[PDB]
């Protein structure tokens, strides 16, 4: 993908907007790779993993592992504050989505794969 | 992403399932790159481009350019026949989604970028 000029200046919602799609590709790819193959199977599986509640729970989990660097912490803060979903779950899921968006747009490919794998480990289990 | 064993044997719906997410990342990235930045802006933009009607129209367009190779034609046939949306628009959009899924999973990265850019040229305009 092309570099986007000043992508790191993007507001939290704009970062969360790309992050949410990125997470969906990783999760759907994961489920295919596990040998699921049926439609109603795969959509039930991915909607469960990609839901706001589940992304909130994932982020909490990763915070207790002290997974993140200070740069990533700053991007999560940006997403959490970006101006039938709970307020706190909205804030945390948007934080997680903004970080994925950020890592993707900044082309931190290795770190993004690491983070999503961790997220998927927890969110599937 | 890891290779998925016998990914090319996947049924049309399973290929369309990953293709649809892939298309969403490309389209969202495109809109960010164009310097859109507002939420209600970007979602209105991408839902318009990624809708079944618009993917049907895109595929028709590309067919008249005789864009596709014979291998890709076979994958479109698989998606079109995979067992408030119109029947024909469903069939064509699923065909387009299965091809993107296929190109992605088979790691035909250059061809996938080519196809999506063409799709986005037409679908935005």
Numbering used by the authors:
A (entry chain A), B (entry chain A): 24 to 106, 113 to 154
What does the paper say about this structure?
The class 4 enzymes, called Mini-III, are homodimeric enzymes and consist solely of the RNase III domains. An enzyme from Bacillus subtilis (BsMiniIII) was shown to be involved in 23S rRNA maturation. The natural substrate for BsMiniIII is 23S pre-rRNA, in which the 3′ and 5′ ends of the molecule are removed to yield a mature 23S rRNA. Here, we present evidence that BsMiniIII is capable of cleaving a long dsRNA substrate in a sequence-specific manner.
Since such structural information could provide crucial insight into the molecular details of the cleavage site selection, we attempted to crystallize a substitution variant (in one of the catalytic residues) of BsMiniIII with dsRNA. Until now, however, we managed to obtain only crystals of the free enzyme, not the complex with the substrate dsRNA. The structure was solved by molecular replacement and refined at 1.8-Å resolution to an R-free of 26.76%. Unfortunately, the loop α5b-α6, suggested to play a major role in contacting the RNA substrate, was not visible in the crystallographic model. A long loop between helices α5 and α6 of the canonical RNases III, including the RBM 4, in Mini-III RNases is replaced by an additional helix, called α5b and a short loop connecting the α5b and α6 helices (called loop α5b-α6). First, we superimposed the BsMiniIII structure onto the A. aeolicus RNase III complex structure and copied the coordinate of the RNA. We homology-modeled the BsMiniIII target dsRNA using ModeRNA and finally modeled the missing loop, minimizing steric clashes between the protein and the RNA. The resulting model suggested that the loop α5b-α6 in BsMiniIII, which is missing from the RNase III, can be easily placed in the major groove of the substrate, where it could make contacts with the target tetranucleotide sequence ACCU/AGGU. Therefore, we inferred that residues in this region may be responsible for sequence-specific recognition of the RNA substrate by BsMiniIII. However, both variants lost the RNase activity completely, suggesting that the presence of an intact loop α5b-α6 is indispensable for the cleavage of dsRNA by BsMiniIII.
